[PDB]
Design a protein around this ligand. Sequence first.
Ligand SMILES: CCCCCCCCCCCCCC
Ligand SMILES: CCCCCCCCCCCCCC
Ligand SMILES: CCCCCCCCCC
Ligand SMILES: CCCCCCCCCC
Ligand SMILES: CCCCCCCCCC
Ligand SMILES: CCCCCCCC
Ligand SMILES: CCCCCCCC
Ligand SMILES: CCCCCCCC
Ligand SMILES: CCCCCCCC
Ligand SMILES: CCCCCCCC
Lengths: 476, 241
Amino acid sequence: TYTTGSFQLILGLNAPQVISGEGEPEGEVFASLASLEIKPEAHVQELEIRLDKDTRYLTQHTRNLQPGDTFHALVEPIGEAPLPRLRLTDSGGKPLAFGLIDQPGESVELNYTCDQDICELVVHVDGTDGQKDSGEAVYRLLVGINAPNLRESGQTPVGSSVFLESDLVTVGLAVDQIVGVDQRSENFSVVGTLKLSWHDPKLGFSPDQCGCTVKSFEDASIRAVAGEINLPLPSFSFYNQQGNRWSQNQVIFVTPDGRASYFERFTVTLQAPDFDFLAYPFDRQKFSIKVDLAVPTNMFIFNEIERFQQVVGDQLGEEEWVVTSYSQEITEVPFERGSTNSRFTTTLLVKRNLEYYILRIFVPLFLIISVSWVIFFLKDYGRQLEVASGNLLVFVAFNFTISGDLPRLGYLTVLDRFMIVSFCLTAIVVLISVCQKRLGAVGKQAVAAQIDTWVLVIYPLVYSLYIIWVYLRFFT
Amino acid sequence: SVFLESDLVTVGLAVDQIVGVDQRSENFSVVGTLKLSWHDPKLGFSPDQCGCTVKSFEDASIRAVAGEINLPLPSFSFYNQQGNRWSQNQVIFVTPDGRASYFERFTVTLQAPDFDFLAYPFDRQKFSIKVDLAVPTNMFIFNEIERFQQVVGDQLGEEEWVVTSYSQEITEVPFERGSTNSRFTTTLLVKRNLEYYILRIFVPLFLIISVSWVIFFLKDYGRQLEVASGNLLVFVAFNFT
Ligand SMILES: CCCCCCCCCCCCCC
Ligand SMILES: CCCCCCCCCCCCCC
Ligand SMILES: CCCCCCCCCC
Ligand SMILES: CCCCCCCCCC
Ligand SMILES: CCCCCCCCCC
Ligand SMILES: CCCCCCCC
Ligand SMILES: CCCCCCCC
Ligand SMILES: CCCCCCCC
Ligand SMILES: CCCCCCCC
Ligand SMILES: CCCCCCCC
C-alpha cells in the first residue's frame, strides 16, 4: 500500500553536510515550489438538506484553508420553498461574510478569501424567519474551495469533501447468559461481550521508533486512554446501568495505519421499568440493552453492525427464561447541550416455562376442586360435611405449600384471583353442607336432594364462565 | 447596585421510578434527574483562546470543579442521603457569556423518619426529597423552578405505591456558621393498592367467620363442636398462610 503523513525536506547545493540530515539554512535560495506556477486545484461538493419544523437551523464545518485560498457557496431550492438566509462565520462565531440575493432571485451566493495562517470556517443556513410550520422544505447546497465556476461546474464533484465527515464506528454485542431477574425492583442481570472498531489516522505511528506492529493498552477504559493520549476517542456507557460494572479482558490495540478496536467482557445489571407482570405466569417480557456514545454525532457515529458470534448463546441444561426472538438496531437520541448521540439497542423476547407451572399448580388444584364437587352424590350429609371441612383445610395446606411460587408484588395477578375464587367456592360448599344437614334434620330430604342436583349442575359452569371471563379480560 | 447581590439559581427535579420502600428501617429509594442553571461573568472566556464555544467538565462533582478552577460554585447535597449515591451522565458546561448549567441522573436512598404505619394497610405516606445548597444565601440562592419533564413519570405495569399528588417549594433553613441556605423540597403523596389487600384477606376471613356463625342452627351439638374445632384450625391455617 501507499503511506500518508507529514514530512520535512532539506535540499542542498554543493553542501556535503546535507546528507547528515542536520544542514542549517544558509546562502541564497535556489529552488521553489512547482505548483505555484499554475492555477491551484479545485474541490467541489454538493449536498441535499431539509429544514424540518424543529430543525430550521443547520451548520456545517469546513476543513482548514491555507492563506490565499478562496471559498464559494450557493443555495437553490428544490421547488417552491422560500429562499433561506446564508452566512459564514469562524469556529468562534465571528461573522465573516453574508449571502447576497442575485437579480434572478432564485439563489443566494457567498464569497470569501483567506488571510490568516489557518482559517476554520462554518457555514450557517437557517430558515427561521418567523414561526411558520411550512413542513418539508428541501434545498440543494453547492460549495467549493478554489472553485469560482460553481455556477456552471459541469464536472461531477471532484477532489475531496469540503465539509468534514464523522468517524464511522462498527459495533457488535453478544449475550451469553441471563443470570437473574428481580421482579420487585424491576431489574435484570446479563453476561456478554462487547466489541468496537474504528479507523483514525491520527492514532497511527511509525514502526521504526518501536520495532513493532501492534501497540496495545490494557485494563483501562476508553476515557482514561483518551485522557492519557490527548486524543478524542469514542467513549460509551450503558444507559440503564445500576451500580458498578464488572469487566474482564479489557484491551485497546492499534495498528500503524490507524485501525483501532476495543474488546470487553462484562457482567452488568440493568433497570427495566417497562416490566408488566399482570398476566403472570403467562406474561411475556422484553429485555432491552442500550449502548449510547458519549460524544456528539458530528464526531463519531455508529455505521454498521457486526455479528462476530451468535447474539444469543446456547448453554447446557434448561433455563427459566426462553428466548423466542431478538433484534438489533441503530438509532439517534437527543443529547445534552443539543446535537445528537448514537444508540445501539439489543432486544430479547422471553417467556416462562409453562409446563412447570401447569403441572406443579393447576392439576392438584383441579383434583382438590373435584374432591369438593364429588361429595354431593352422598345422601348421608354428616359425611359430606366432614369431608368438606377436611377438604377446606387440605386446600389451605396446598395453597401455603405452593406459596413459594407466588410473587409478592403488591398487586393482583391471575393466579391470586383464581386461588381466591377457588377458596371462596370451597367455603360456600361447607356452608351449603351445613344447610343441607339442618334441612335433613328437620325432615325435608327432598329439598336437600334438589339442592344437591342444583350444585352439581351449577359449579363446573361457574368455573368455566370465570375462566372465559379471565381470558377475555386479560388475553384479548 | 451599591450592595452586592446574590447569584440566582434555577433548579428542577423529576422522579422516574420508586424502586423500594423499607418499612422497618424507614427509608426508600428513588431514581430521577436533577438540573441546575445559573449565570456568572467570572466564568466567561474568549473563544479565540480555545477555538470552541462550549467548555465542558465531565464525571466530576461541583466541589471538584470548583476546587480545580479556584472559583466559588453552587454545590449541593441531599439532606437525608443514606450511604453513597450512584450518578450517571454528570456534566458541567459553560458558555462564553458565563451561563453555566449542571445535569445528573441519580439513584439514591433517603431516610424517612416521618413514616407512620398505624393505619396499615389503609395508611397514607409522604415521600419528601430535599436538596440543600452548601453555601450561604448571600452567595447563591434558588430563585426559580424549571419543569423540564414531568415530575412523576408513567411506567408500564402496575405499582405497589400510587402517587396521588405532588408539590414543589423553595424555602430557607438555618445554616452552620450562621447565615442561611436555600432548600428545594419535592413531596409525593402515595397510597397502597387496596383491592389487593381487600380481595386477598378480608373476603376469606369473612367466609371463615360465617362458617363459624352458621353452625348454631344445628341441634346436634356434637357435630357443632366438631365443626367448630375444625374451623378454629382452618382459621389458624389461613392466618399463618
Ligand atoms: C367441578 C369438577 C369437575 C367435575 C366434572 C364435572 C363434569 C360435568 C358433569 C355434570 C353432571 C351432572 C349430574 C347431575
Ligand atoms: C356473623 C357472620 C354474618 C352472618 C350474617 C348475619 C346477619 C344477621 C342475621 C340475624 C339472624 C338471627 C336469627 C335468630
Ligand atoms: C386448574 C384449574 C381447574 C379449575 C376447575 C375446572 C372446572 C372445569 C369444569 C368443566
Ligand atoms: C353468610 C352466609 C349466610 C348463610 C345462611 C344459612 C341459612 C341456614 C338456616 C337453616
Ligand atoms: C394464554 C393462557 C390463558 C390463560 C387463561 C385462563 C387462566 C385461568 C386462571 C389461572
Ligand atoms: C415448558 C413446556 C411448555 C408448555 C408445555 C405444556 C405441557 C404441559
Ligand atoms: C388429571 C388432572 C387434570 C388437571 C387439569 C387442569 C390443568 C390444565
Ligand atoms: C374476584 C374475586 C371474587 C371473590 C369471591 C367470589 C365468590 C364466588
Ligand atoms: C386498587 C383498587 C383500589 C380499591 C378498589 C376497591 C375494589 C375492591
Ligand atoms: C369487605 C370484605 C368483607 C365482605 C366479604 C364478602 C364475601 C362474599
